[PDB]
Design a protein around this ligand. Structure first.
Ligand code: MG
Ligand code: MG
Length: 245
């Protein structure tokens, strides 16, 4: 009787980094008459809020809003607290990681550098060799240089080796940055809080459920019924089959 559908945002519910089609959002609300619904995204809260309504309408349209993989949580309109990356990792390791990064980037010579090479978020560190504060034209410029030169990839190889065995995971999401977060702090992080909400079934939907994609772990977890989708339209049809047959 208590079921939750939980959705990746990008490519599952919305075109990536863009806004949800009204027909999609309309279906979701209809679906809500049979199940609770929720979203989990890698992005921070405001980015998700923007794709999924006006202002803070997102926390109203969805029963659960897990931003930054669930290190930041909204449940039934209310913001829950957040375990901090430094609390979990401790100051010594966090700073070891940070100092490794500053040192590596100091030796990097790029066409352009800007600011915010290291962004401190709730559940990860976003590392960006060009600097997060560049224009779109500068994103594209660096992005093309990165493919040629594999700047982020090399950086991530060096980081992985250096911190081997120490509990860190790395990404490479987008044109200019990569993420660093504690082992476990992928999308699965949200499931722990969900465990205390007594659902009989948690269905997960994603578009990156293949090995490597950021939906894989949450998709494969024994706490969720996994579904793999290719489009928001695919997602909608899938829910039609399962919940409106
Ligand atoms: Mg996606
Ligand atoms: Mg599963």
């Amino acid at each position: 009787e208590r079921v939750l559908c939980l959705f990746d945002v990008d490519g599952t519910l919305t075109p990536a980094r863009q806004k949800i089609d009204p027909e999609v959002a309309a279906f979701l609300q209809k679906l809500r008459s049979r199940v609770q619904i929720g979203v989990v995204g890698g992005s921070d809260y405001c980015k998700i809020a923007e794709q999924l309504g006006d202002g803070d309408e997102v926390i109203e349209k969805f029963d659960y809003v897990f931003a930054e993989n669930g290190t930041v949580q909204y449940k039934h309109g209310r913001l829950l607290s957040k375990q901090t990356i430094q609390n979990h990792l401790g100051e010594e390791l966090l700073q070891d990681l940070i100092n490794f990064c500053l040192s590596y980037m100091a030796l990097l010579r790029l066409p352009k550098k800007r600011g915010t090479f290291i962004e401190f978020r709730n559940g990860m560190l976003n590392i960006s060799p060009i600097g997060r504060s560049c224009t779109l034209e500068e994103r594209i410029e660096f992005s093309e240089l990165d493919k040629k030169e594999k700047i982020r990839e090399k950086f991530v190889e060096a980081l992985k080796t250096e911190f081997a065995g120490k509990g860190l995971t790395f990404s490479i999401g987008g044109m200019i940055s990569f993420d660093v977060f504690p082992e476990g702090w992928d999308k699965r992080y949200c499931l722990d809080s969900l465990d205390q909400d007594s659902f009989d079934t948690i269905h997960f939907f994603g578009n990156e459920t293949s090995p490597g994609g950021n939906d894989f772990e949450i998709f494969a977890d024994p706490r969720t019924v996994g579904h793999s989708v290719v489009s928001p339209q695919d997602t909608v049809q899938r829910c039609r089959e399962i919940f409106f047959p």
